[PDB]
């Protein structure tokens, strides 16, 4: 009989759901890694500019 | 990242200045020595026009 088994047909639909949201808990983290990363690509280029600029000034001064 | 970029430029922008200082006084020296051996010539040239 299905009684205890009756409950495993739900626990399988409500396991489908919980995996679909651990396929969103991965997507969210992808976007957030690609965000955190890009905030440091902007950090890299802007500093590089300010170091190109600081030595160029100090040459014209010299 | 800021911290080691600011410390990157500083440790070059003292060295560069220090070295430019060595060159400034040698390039001052490089025009003086030419001049004092082309000296009797300026003095002569000036003089011939201050006595009319």
CB contact under 8 A, A50 and B17: no
Phi first, then psi, for residue A33 (nearest 5°) are -70, -45
Interface check B13 vs A, CB under 8 A: yes
- Cα(B1)–Cα(A50) distance, integer angstroms: 12
- Contact predicate B12/A55, CB 8 Å: yes
Best B5, B6, B10, B16 member to test A by mutation, with max A CBs in 10 Å, is B5
Q: List C-alpha distances in Å: A48 to A51, A61, B1, B48.
A: 5, 20, 10, 61
- Contact predicate A58/B13, CB 8 Å: yes
> How far is B28 from chain A, CA to nearest CA, in Å?
14
Whose CA is closest to B17, among A58, A50, A53?
A58
CA atoms within 13 A on the CB side of A55: 14
Method used to obtain the model: cryo-EM
Best A47, A49, A59, A61 member to test B by mutation, with max B CBs in 10 Å, is A47
Q: Which residues contact A51 (CB under 8 A, 6 or more apart)?
A: B5, B8, B9
End-to-end CA distance of chain B: give it in Å, rounded: 73
Structure tokens at B30: 């490089």
Structure tokens at B2: 């800021």
Place of tokens 């690509």: A41
- Cα(B52)–Cα(B49) distance, integer angstroms: 7
DSSP codes of every residue in B3-46: HHHHHHHHTTTTHHHHHHHHHHHHHHHHHHHHHHTS-HHHHHHH
């Amino acid at each position: 009989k299905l009684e205890a088994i009756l409950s495993q047909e739900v626990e399988a639909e409500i396991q489908a759901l919980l995996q679909e949201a651990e396929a969103k808990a991965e997507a969210v983290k992808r976007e957030a890694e690609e965000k955190a990363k890009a905030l440091l690509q902007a950090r890299e280029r802007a500093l590089e500019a300010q170091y190109r600029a600081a030595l160029r000034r100090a040459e014209s001064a010299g | 990242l800021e911290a080691q970029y600011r410390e990157r430029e500083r440790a070059e922008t003292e060295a560069l200045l220090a070295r430019y200082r060595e060159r400034a006084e040698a390039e001052a020296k490089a025009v003086r020595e030419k001049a004092m051996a082309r000296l009797d010539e300026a003095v002569a040239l000036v003089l011939k026009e201050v006595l009319p």
